[PDB]
Amino acid sequence: RKIWWWWL
């Protein structure tokens, strides 16, 4: 994916 892990 990309950044779809943490900042969520």
Question: In angstroms, rounded to a whole number, what is the distance separating the alpha carbons of residues 1 and 8?
Answer: 13
How many residues in the chain?
A: 8
Q: Please, which experimental method was used?
A: NMR
* Radius of gyration over every alpha carbon of the chain, rounded to an integer in angstroms: 5
Question: In angstroms, rounded to a whole number, what is the distance separating the alpha carbons of residues 2 and 8?
Answer: 12
Quick one: DSSP state of residue 3?
S
Question: In angstroms, rounded to a whole number, what is the distance separating the alpha carbons of residues 6 and 8?
Answer: 5
Question: In angstroms, rounded to a whole number, what is the distance separating the alpha carbons of residues 7 and 3?
Answer: 7
Q: Which residue has the tokens 């943490």?
A: 6
What one-letter code names the amino acid at 7?
W
